[PDB]
Structures are given as structure tokens and as C-alpha cells.
Backbone:
């Protein structure tokens, strides 16, 4: 249920629907698509938790 | 109760004031009310106090 | 000594380019017709790397 | 094996990952995983986890 | 040396300073009785 | 300061670095006069023997 | 369970002897007429080695 | 700036001498006929003390 990935490589957002990610940051996963494209909620310090799409091959998952 | 939490995955803090901890760790909560709504919380572990993403730990009552 | 500051996030589209995060400081080295500058990135910890970037992702600073 | 031990003499840890504790302290054992068979053990006390020389404690009882 | 543009430090251990400030190199440096780090380009 | 020889830190709070490294000095003259200085390199801060630099 | 703590630095003068640094803990095994004890050294990382040392370089600890 | 590193443990046989533990760094000051050097010991916490030691208990480091 609580599925959580970590940013492995830098990704600047190519649209208004997408997150823009810096290596290290943690993402709570919400949806996954056919493309290789996931929706997630970004846990980054300071900024309010924003919710958007990103290419999945710029993150690594973490397992309990 | 409203006091401790168990860490589900291990975390390594980026800043100076972030709380590094290993997996399974029991952490004492100090603030979980509000810190600018950025899904971080604050707590003590191993005699170091800091902040950490609230996503990474699970609750445990009583 | 010409020096710009990163105004918006830019991920590098090639091996010749810098990859920038808002706040960071760049020493400028060359400027081109495209809208494309070469610079040396002053970022904490990493060795000073030297590359190209779209100039409309930075703001200059004047003495 | 055995869950707890009482500290016969007080100890002060040299490294960061060593466990400082006072005399008489009840400590919860976690590992006797011979590291390099150096005769330390690992345990929790006061919500700080670490390692300590196994020679300073005894199995708890009365 | 002398600071050409004013800077504000991000971390705890970075040196905030105003423009024109004289800083004693210890980068490395003290100013107003606070020691810290700063981009040498400034 | 530029590192003349490479160093590997013993403790947790010591600064490991390679040879030639540019390090930004953070302090000097400890409470105890020990010869170690403090600095940042590669986004890790720590202390190092001042005899290894410049 | 008799246990001493190193009070002063002692480098080993032979192959039969421990070499000690202040702070370290020794479990005592034998004591001799000379002022010379055998002990097992509890030091972090190294395997527990067992050897002789001048007793006036350690302090005992009592329960 | 000549700088050696301690290769083997040495306990001091007199008041004029350093006590050395493997790993420690020594700034070299004088070198003698005996095989005996003066140096300043850079060790963490203690004030930098200055004394004599057998040279065959250290290794030099070259730039």
C-alpha cells in the first residue's frame, strides 16, 4: 500500500502536469501507467506536497 | 502512544538538521502537528534530534 | 568577472551541457548566437564543471 | 538465547556507534554477531542503540 | 577581500554578508564575528 | 585550500578527501589547540590535519 | 570475572606480550611474582588477543 | 613541509621523546645520525607536542 520511491537522476518537468525532481528526493507513488510514466506525491522539505507525473526510469523504489 | 514510531525503510539525511536513521528504528516524535505542511516531522533517535519525511515511518499506539 | 544566478530548473539534454538547480551560481565564459552560454558552475561539494546551457534559465548579477 | 543484561560497571563509548551506559543499567541484547570476534555485543538502552564490551555485563537474574 | 555582490547563505555553515564587506580569508572566511563558507566568485 | 596528499578520516566527524582537492576552510584554533582544521568538500563537512593542505 | 583498565601507554617488548593504549579493557587471567600479568584484551575490531604486560600500566575495576 | 606517518607502535623510553600509535601524522623538524628524528605530532584533541623518536617506526609521504 504505502509505496515509496527515491529520485535516482535529475528530471526537469516538460509540462504543467509533471513534477520536477532532484536526486535524493522521496516520492509517494499514487498511479502507474503503460508509458513508463508514474504519478506521485513529492515529499520535499519546505515546499507544500505537490502531486504530479514523471518518467519512472528517473527513480528507484525502496522495499520494506 | 502519540509518542514513538517504527521506521519502515532506512533514511539518510541531506541537510545538517535532518535525522539519519536505520530501518526498524524506534523514534520519539517531538513535532507532528505542523511544520509548513511539507510532510516532514521532528524526532529523537540515538541522542540526535532532527527532521525526517513522515512517509518513512509507521505509527504505533499504546 | 561576469556572474549569473540560476532562475529556473534545467536538466541537461546532452553531454556538453550543465544541469542546473535554482539558486546556483555560474561564472560565464562564452556566449553564442542561439541563446546558449558556456559557464563554470560554482556548486557546493561537486568539482567545478564547465558546460553549455540555455541563457533564459539564468539571471545576471551586476556590481 | 537471552533478552536482557545488567551492567556491572559503567562504560563510556569511544566511537559514535558505541553504547554509553551507567552502572546497574538493564540493556536489551540485539546481536552477539561476532564482528571480527572482538568480544563486543550490541544493545539498546535509553533509546540509544550501540555496541559495548561484553565483559562489562552479566545475564540478568537474582 | 571585498565583496562585489551581497550573498545570503543557504546552509547553517555558510557565510551571509552584505555588498562591499571586507572579509578575512581563512571559501574560507570571517565577517562580523561569524565564520563560514561562500562562493569565491562573489 | 588545495590538498597536497590524500587523506582518509578515522572518526565519523573527520573529512575524507583525495589529493589536489580544493577545500573551503571553516575554522581554526580548536578549544584544545590540536592542529586540526574544519572544512567542506564534496558536500560533506568535517575536520582534517592542517599539515596536509596548501 | 576480574577486569582491569589501561591507565598508561605500553608498547610490547616481546612476542609474548600485549601492546596497550590508555582506555582499553583487559580481562585478567594470571598474575605473577614479577609485577607481570597475563590478560585478554577487549579492543574494538581486532580479534581478542591474549598476552603478558607490566601490571603497573593498568588499574583494576571493582563491582 | 616534510610529513611522515606512524607505521608501528612506539612507547617513549624518555622525557625527550614522543609516544606514537599507528596511523598518527608527524611533521618532521630535525633528523640525526642515530636513526632518530625530532617531530611535531598532529594528533586529535591533545596539544601539538614536539619530541624525538626512532625513524624506523614511521613511513614518509611524498607530494
Residues:
Amino acid at each position: 500500500k504505502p509505496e515509496i520511491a527515491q529520485v535516482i537522476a535529475s528530471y526537469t518537468a516538460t509540462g504543467p502536469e509533471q513534477l520536477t525532481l532532484a536526486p535524493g528526493q522521496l516520492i509517494l507513488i499514487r498511479k502507474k501507467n503503460p508509458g513508463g510514466w508514474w504519478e506521485g506525491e513529492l515529499q520535499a522539505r519546505g515546499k507544500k506536497r505537490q502531486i504530479g507525473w514523471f518518467p519512472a526510469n528517473y527513480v528507484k523504489l525502496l522495499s520494506p | 502512544s502519540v509518542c514513538f514510531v517504527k521506521a519502515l525503510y532506512d533514511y539518510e539525511g541531506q541537510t545538517d538538521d535532518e535525522l539519519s536513521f536505520p530501518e526498524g528504528a524506534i523514534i520519539r516524535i517531538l513535532n507532528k502537528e505542523n511544520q509548513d505542511d511539507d510532510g516532514f516531522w521532528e524526532g529523537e533517535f540515538n541522542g540526535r534530534i532532527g527532521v525526517f519525511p513522515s512517509v518513512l515511518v509507521e505509527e504505533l499506539s499504546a
